[PDB]
Amino acid sequence: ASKRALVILAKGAEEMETVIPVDVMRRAGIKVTVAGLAGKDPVQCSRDVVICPDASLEDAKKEGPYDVVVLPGGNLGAQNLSESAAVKEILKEQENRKGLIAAICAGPTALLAHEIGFGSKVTTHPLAKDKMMNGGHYTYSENRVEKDGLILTSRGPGTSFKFALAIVEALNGKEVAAQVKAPLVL
Amino acid sequence: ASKRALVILAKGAEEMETVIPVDVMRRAGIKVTVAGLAGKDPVQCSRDVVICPDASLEDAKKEGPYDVVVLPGGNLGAQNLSESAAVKEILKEQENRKGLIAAICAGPTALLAHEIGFGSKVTTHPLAKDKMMNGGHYTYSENRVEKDGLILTSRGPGTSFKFALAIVEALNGKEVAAQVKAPLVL
């Protein structure tokens, strides 16, 4: 059986933080669905890269559950994730079934919006710390990747490989992560 | 005036090696055109990310010249670049006007196919070395980024940030590269 990942792609997402996890997880033999928040239409990312999702979020949500739900960053992408009732439902479900949730850069602020994983140790992009920490519902970390149980967080474009490999390790183990890492030239 | 980059996107391109340079160059204030080799249609990358180009290569070539021409890797993407007469013409023109050419992973093997930059020091992905070195027309390097005059090469997904920042430095200078780098959390 292979593990399955849902990557929720919204307008304004950081395209590096979208593509690096998708690509690295597919290298790991994970079945990844890139789901468009607003439907199956093309998504204009933060630096104007346009990505065609595999499915709408509407459809992808009917096909879970997923072994990981991944939230890319980008300030505007994260705001769109934070405002979505569909994202709230997916994350609550995932938390309740004790499934991994992985969020990078501003992405973890959607956890705050949806009241996910309170009491966890988290990191974010430095510029998103104050938003994440409003109310003191999480404990902050400056590690490049932080994992507290089923909440996996990371900091920015430059930590995306480490973040993606941490997802691979959580799902498929250390050996697979190491095998995937070598040909990346990291 | 802003500098201009042409990124040539072919089926089978390594999507990380496409998106990381595009995004980092746009952060640097470079005007980037993501040009589809086969036209303006969506491009299915090596790990199945689908990117919508900004323009066809046919149209983008009419709008140069460009301060850098960027060739992503991916074994199949690089083969498509290597087989294209349009790519040959663009690279020859760029070499003749003494413009930068930047290629990552298997991407530099398109330089070999098109007889570009012979006698240069280059690197590639380790698995592409033998292809690149057929005939001994280049001198090989294991540095993560190699620059010999106007030929700029790099090794793999994991060197893409360094590669992109090297392009930024070449075009816009050290200070801009350092300013762009900090918020990446590298």
Coordinates of C-alpha atoms in Angstrom, one line a residue:
Chain A
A1 CA 0.0 0.0 0.0
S2 CA 1.3 3.5 -0.6
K3 CA 0.8 6.5 1.6
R4 CA -1.2 9.5 0.4
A5 CA -0.7 13.2 0.7
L6 CA -3.1 16.1 0.1
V7 CA -1.4 19.4 -0.8
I8 CA -3.8 22.3 -0.6
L9 CA -3.0 24.9 -3.2
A10 CA -4.5 28.5 -2.9
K11 CA -3.9 31.7 -4.9
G12 CA -0.8 33.4 -3.5
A13 CA 0.9 30.2 -2.3
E14 CA 4.7 30.2 -2.3
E15 CA 5.3 28.1 -5.4
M16 CA 8.7 26.7 -4.1
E17 CA 7.0 25.6 -0.9
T18 CA 4.4 23.8 -3.0
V19 CA 6.6 22.2 -5.6
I20 CA 9.5 21.1 -3.4
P21 CA 7.2 19.0 -1.1
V22 CA 5.1 17.6 -4.0
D23 CA 8.2 16.5 -6.0
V24 CA 10.1 15.1 -3.0
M25 CA 7.0 13.2 -1.8
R26 CA 6.5 11.7 -5.3
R27 CA 10.2 10.7 -5.3
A28 CA 9.4 8.8 -2.0
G29 CA 6.6 6.9 -3.7
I30 CA 3.8 8.9 -1.9
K31 CA 0.6 9.3 -3.9
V32 CA 0.2 13.2 -3.9
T33 CA -2.9 15.1 -4.8
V34 CA -2.4 18.8 -5.5
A35 CA -5.8 20.1 -4.7
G36 CA -6.9 23.6 -5.8
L37 CA -8.7 25.4 -3.0
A38 CA -10.9 27.3 -5.4
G39 CA -11.4 24.5 -7.8
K40 CA -9.5 22.8 -10.6
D41 CA -8.5 26.0 -12.3
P42 CA -4.9 27.2 -12.6
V43 CA -3.5 28.8 -9.5
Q44 CA -1.4 31.9 -9.7
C45 CA 1.3 31.6 -7.0
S46 CA 3.0 34.3 -5.1
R47 CA 5.8 34.8 -7.7
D48 CA 3.4 34.4 -10.6
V49 CA 4.2 30.7 -11.4
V50 CA 0.9 29.2 -12.5
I51 CA 0.3 25.6 -11.4
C52 CA -2.5 23.3 -12.7
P53 CA -3.9 21.4 -9.8
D54 CA -4.7 17.7 -10.0
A55 CA -8.2 18.1 -8.6
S56 CA -10.4 20.6 -6.9
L57 CA -10.3 20.5 -3.1
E58 CA -14.0 19.7 -3.3
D59 CA -13.3 16.5 -5.1
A60 CA -10.1 15.6 -3.3
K61 CA -11.7 15.9 0.1
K62 CA -14.2 13.2 -0.9
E63 CA -11.3 10.9 -1.6
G64 CA -9.5 10.9 1.6
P65 CA -8.4 10.4 4.3
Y66 CA -4.8 11.2 3.7
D67 CA -1.7 10.2 5.6
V68 CA -0.6 13.9 5.5
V69 CA -2.3 17.2 4.8
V70 CA 0.3 19.8 3.6
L71 CA -0.2 23.5 3.8
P72 CA 2.3 25.6 1.8
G73 CA 3.2 29.1 2.8
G74 CA 3.1 32.5 1.1
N75 CA 1.4 35.2 3.1
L76 CA -1.7 35.4 0.7
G77 CA -1.9 31.7 0.2
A78 CA -2.0 31.1 3.9
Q79 CA -4.7 33.8 4.4
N80 CA -6.8 32.0 1.8
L81 CA -6.3 28.7 3.6
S82 CA -7.2 30.4 6.9
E83 CA -10.5 31.7 5.5
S84 CA -11.7 28.4 4.1
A85 CA -14.4 26.3 5.8
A86 CA -13.4 23.3 3.7
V87 CA -9.8 23.6 5.0
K88 CA -11.1 23.8 8.5
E89 CA -13.1 20.6 8.1
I90 CA -10.2 18.8 6.5
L91 CA -7.8 19.8 9.2
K92 CA -10.1 19.0 12.1
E93 CA -10.8 15.6 10.6
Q94 CA -7.1 14.9 10.2
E95 CA -6.4 16.0 13.8
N96 CA -9.2 13.8 15.1
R97 CA -8.0 10.7 13.2
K98 CA -4.5 11.4 14.4
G99 CA -3.1 12.0 10.9
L100 CA 0.0 14.2 10.2
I101 CA -0.5 17.9 9.4
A102 CA 2.5 19.6 7.8
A103 CA 2.7 23.4 7.3
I104 CA 5.5 25.7 6.2
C105 CA 6.4 29.5 6.4
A106 CA 3.0 31.4 6.9
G107 CA 1.2 28.1 6.4
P108 CA 1.0 27.3 10.1
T109 CA -1.1 30.4 10.7
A110 CA -3.9 28.5 9.1
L111 CA -3.6 26.0 12.0
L112 CA -4.2 29.0 14.4
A113 CA -7.2 30.2 12.3
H114 CA -8.8 26.7 12.5
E115 CA -7.8 26.0 16.1
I116 CA -5.6 23.1 15.2
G117 CA -3.0 21.6 17.4
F118 CA -3.1 24.1 20.2
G119 CA -0.4 23.5 22.8
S120 CA 2.1 22.3 20.2
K121 CA 5.7 23.5 19.6
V122 CA 5.8 25.1 16.2
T123 CA 7.9 27.2 13.9
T124 CA 7.0 29.6 11.1
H125 CA 8.7 32.1 8.9
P126 CA 10.2 34.7 11.2
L127 CA 7.8 37.3 9.8
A128 CA 4.8 35.2 10.6
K129 CA 5.8 34.5 14.2
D130 CA 3.6 37.3 15.7
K131 CA 0.6 36.2 13.8
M132 CA 1.1 32.6 14.8
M133 CA 1.6 33.5 18.5
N134 CA -1.4 35.7 18.9
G135 CA -3.0 34.4 22.1
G136 CA -0.1 32.2 23.1
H137 CA -1.8 29.0 21.8
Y138 CA 1.5 27.5 20.6
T139 CA 5.1 27.5 21.9
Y140 CA 7.5 28.9 19.4
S141 CA 10.7 27.3 18.0
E142 CA 13.4 28.6 15.7
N143 CA 14.4 25.2 14.5
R144 CA 14.3 24.8 10.7
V145 CA 11.8 22.0 11.0
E146 CA 9.8 21.3 14.2
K147 CA 7.7 18.3 14.8
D148 CA 5.5 17.9 17.9
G149 CA 3.5 14.7 17.4
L150 CA 1.3 15.1 14.3
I151 CA 2.0 18.8 13.8
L152 CA 5.0 19.3 11.6
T153 CA 6.1 22.9 10.8
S154 CA 9.0 24.7 9.0
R155 CA 10.2 28.1 8.2
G156 CA 10.7 29.2 4.6
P157 CA 11.6 28.4 1.0
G158 CA 15.1 27.5 2.1
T159 CA 13.9 24.9 4.6
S160 CA 11.5 23.2 2.1
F161 CA 13.8 20.3 1.4
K162 CA 14.3 19.6 5.1
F163 CA 10.5 19.9 5.6
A164 CA 9.6 17.6 2.7
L165 CA 12.2 15.0 3.8
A166 CA 10.7 15.2 7.3
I167 CA 7.3 14.3 5.8
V168 CA 8.9 11.4 4.0
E169 CA 10.6 10.2 7.1
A170 CA 7.3 10.4 9.1
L171 CA 5.4 8.5 6.5
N172 CA 7.9 6.1 4.9
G173 CA 10.8 6.0 7.3
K174 CA 14.4 7.1 7.7
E175 CA 15.8 4.8 5.1
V176 CA 13.5 6.0 2.3
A177 CA 14.1 9.6 3.3
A178 CA 17.9 9.0 3.0
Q179 CA 17.5 7.2 -0.3
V180 CA 15.4 10.1 -1.7
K181 CA 17.8 12.7 -0.4
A182 CA 21.0 11.5 -2.0
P183 CA 20.1 12.2 -5.7
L184 CA 18.9 15.7 -4.7
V185 CA 22.5 16.9 -4.2
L186 CA 21.8 18.6 -0.9
Chain B
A1 CA 15.9 49.3 -16.5
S2 CA 15.4 45.8 -15.3
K3 CA 17.2 42.7 -16.4
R4 CA 15.3 40.0 -18.3
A5 CA 15.5 36.2 -18.0
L6 CA 14.2 33.5 -20.4
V7 CA 13.5 30.1 -18.7
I8 CA 12.9 27.4 -21.3
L9 CA 10.3 24.9 -20.1
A10 CA 10.0 21.5 -21.7
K11 CA 8.1 18.3 -20.9
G12 CA 10.0 16.3 -18.3
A13 CA 11.7 19.3 -16.8
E14 CA 12.6 19.1 -13.1
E15 CA 9.9 21.3 -11.6
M16 CA 12.0 22.3 -8.6
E17 CA 14.8 23.4 -10.9
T18 CA 12.3 25.5 -12.9
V19 CA 10.3 27.1 -10.1
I20 CA 13.2 27.9 -7.7
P21 CA 15.1 30.0 -10.3
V22 CA 11.9 31.7 -11.6
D23 CA 10.8 32.6 -8.1
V24 CA 14.2 33.7 -6.8
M25 CA 14.9 35.8 -10.0
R26 CA 11.4 37.5 -9.6
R27 CA 12.3 38.3 -6.0
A28 CA 15.4 40.0 -7.4
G29 CA 13.3 42.2 -9.6
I30 CA 14.3 40.4 -12.8
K31 CA 11.6 40.2 -15.5
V32 CA 11.2 36.4 -16.1
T33 CA 9.5 34.8 -19.1
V34 CA 8.7 31.1 -18.6
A35 CA 8.6 30.0 -22.2
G36 CA 7.1 26.7 -23.2
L37 CA 9.3 24.8 -25.7
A38 CA 6.3 23.2 -27.4
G39 CA 4.0 26.2 -27.2
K40 CA 1.8 27.9 -24.6
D41 CA 0.2 24.7 -23.4
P42 CA 0.6 23.3 -19.9
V43 CA 3.8 21.5 -19.3
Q44 CA 4.0 18.2 -17.4
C45 CA 7.2 18.2 -15.4
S46 CA 9.2 15.2 -14.3
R47 CA 7.3 14.7 -11.0
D48 CA 3.9 15.5 -12.6
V49 CA 3.7 19.1 -11.5
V50 CA 1.9 20.9 -14.4
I51 CA 3.1 24.5 -15.0
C52 CA 1.4 27.0 -17.3
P53 CA 4.0 28.9 -19.3
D54 CA 3.9 32.7 -19.7
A55 CA 4.4 32.4 -23.5
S56 CA 5.4 30.0 -26.1
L57 CA 9.1 29.8 -26.9
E58 CA 8.2 30.9 -30.4
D59 CA 6.8 34.1 -29.2
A60 CA 9.3 34.7 -26.4
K61 CA 12.2 34.3 -28.8
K62 CA 10.9 37.2 -30.8
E63 CA 11.0 39.4 -27.7
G64 CA 14.5 39.1 -26.7
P65 CA 17.4 39.4 -26.3
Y66 CA 17.6 38.3 -22.7
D67 CA 20.3 39.0 -20.0
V68 CA 20.2 35.2 -19.1
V69 CA 18.8 32.1 -20.8
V70 CA 18.1 29.4 -18.1
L71 CA 17.9 25.7 -18.9
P72 CA 16.3 23.6 -16.1
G73 CA 17.3 19.9 -15.7
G74 CA 15.4 16.7 -15.6
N75 CA 16.7 14.0 -17.8
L76 CA 13.7 14.1 -20.3
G77 CA 13.4 17.9 -20.2
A78 CA 17.1 18.3 -21.1
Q79 CA 16.7 15.8 -23.9
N80 CA 13.8 17.9 -25.3
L81 CA 16.0 21.0 -25.1
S82 CA 18.9 19.2 -26.8
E83 CA 16.7 18.2 -29.7
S84 CA 15.2 21.6 -30.4
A85 CA 16.5 23.8 -33.3
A86 CA 14.8 26.8 -31.6
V87 CA 16.9 26.3 -28.5
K88 CA 20.0 25.9 -30.6
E89 CA 19.4 29.3 -32.2
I90 CA 18.6 31.0 -28.9
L91 CA 21.7 29.7 -27.3
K92 CA 24.0 30.5 -30.2
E93 CA 22.7 34.0 -30.3
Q94 CA 23.1 34.4 -26.6
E95 CA 26.7 33.1 -26.7
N96 CA 27.5 35.4 -29.7
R97 CA 26.2 38.5 -27.9
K98 CA 28.1 37.5 -24.8
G99 CA 25.0 37.0 -22.7
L100 CA 24.8 34.7 -19.6
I101 CA 23.6 31.1 -20.1
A102 CA 22.7 29.2 -16.9
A103 CA 22.0 25.4 -16.9
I104 CA 21.3 23.0 -14.0
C105 CA 21.5 19.2 -13.4
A106 CA 21.0 17.5 -16.9
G107 CA 20.4 20.9 -18.4
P108 CA 24.1 21.5 -19.3
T109 CA 23.9 18.5 -21.7
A110 CA 21.8 20.7 -24.0
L111 CA 24.9 23.0 -24.2
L112 CA 26.9 20.0 -25.5
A113 CA 24.1 19.1 -28.0
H114 CA 24.2 22.6 -29.4
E115 CA 28.0 23.1 -29.3
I116 CA 27.7 25.9 -26.8
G117 CA 30.6 27.1 -24.6
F118 CA 33.1 24.4 -25.5
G119 CA 36.3 24.7 -23.4
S120 CA 34.4 25.9 -20.3
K121 CA 34.6 24.5 -16.8
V122 CA 31.1 23.0 -16.0
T123 CA 29.3 20.9 -13.5
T124 CA 26.2 18.7 -13.9
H125 CA 24.2 16.3 -11.9
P126 CA 26.6 13.4 -11.1
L127 CA 24.5 11.0 -13.2
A128 CA 24.8 13.4 -16.2
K129 CA 28.6 13.7 -16.1
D130 CA 29.4 11.0 -18.7
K131 CA 26.9 12.4 -21.2
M132 CA 28.3 16.0 -20.7
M133 CA 31.9 14.8 -21.0
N134 CA 31.5 12.8 -24.2
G135 CA 34.2 14.0 -26.4
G136 CA 36.0 16.0 -23.7
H137 CA 34.7 19.3 -24.8
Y138 CA 34.4 20.7 -21.3
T139 CA 36.4 20.4 -18.1
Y140 CA 34.4 18.9 -15.2
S141 CA 33.9 20.4 -11.8
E142 CA 32.2 19.0 -8.7
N143 CA 31.5 22.4 -7.3
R144 CA 27.8 23.0 -6.4
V145 CA 27.7 26.0 -8.8
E146 CA 30.4 26.6 -11.5
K147 CA 30.8 29.8 -13.5
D148 CA 33.3 30.1 -16.3
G149 CA 32.6 33.4 -17.9
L150 CA 29.1 33.4 -19.4
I151 CA 28.5 29.6 -18.7
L152 CA 26.9 29.1 -15.3
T153 CA 26.1 25.5 -14.3
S154 CA 24.9 23.6 -11.2
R155 CA 24.2 20.1 -10.0
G156 CA 20.7 19.3 -8.8
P157 CA 17.5 20.2 -7.0
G158 CA 19.4 20.8 -3.8
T159 CA 21.8 23.3 -5.5
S160 CA 19.0 25.3 -7.1
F161 CA 18.9 28.1 -4.5
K162 CA 22.7 28.6 -4.9
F163 CA 22.3 28.4 -8.7
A164 CA 19.4 31.0 -8.7
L165 CA 21.3 33.3 -6.4
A166 CA 24.4 33.0 -8.6
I167 CA 22.2 34.2 -11.5
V168 CA 21.0 37.1 -9.4
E169 CA 24.5 38.0 -8.4
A170 CA 25.7 38.0 -12.0
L171 CA 22.8 40.2 -13.2
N172 CA 22.0 42.5 -10.3
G173 CA 25.0 42.2 -8.0
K174 CA 26.1 40.8 -4.6
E175 CA 24.1 43.2 -2.5
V176 CA 20.8 42.3 -4.3
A177 CA 21.6 38.6 -4.0
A178 CA 22.2 38.9 -0.3
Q179 CA 19.0 40.9 0.2
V180 CA 17.0 38.3 -1.7
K181 CA 18.7 35.4 0.2
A182 CA 17.9 36.5 3.8
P183 CA 14.1 36.1 3.7
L184 CA 14.5 32.6 2.1
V185 CA 15.7 31.2 5.4
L186 CA 18.7 29.4 3.8

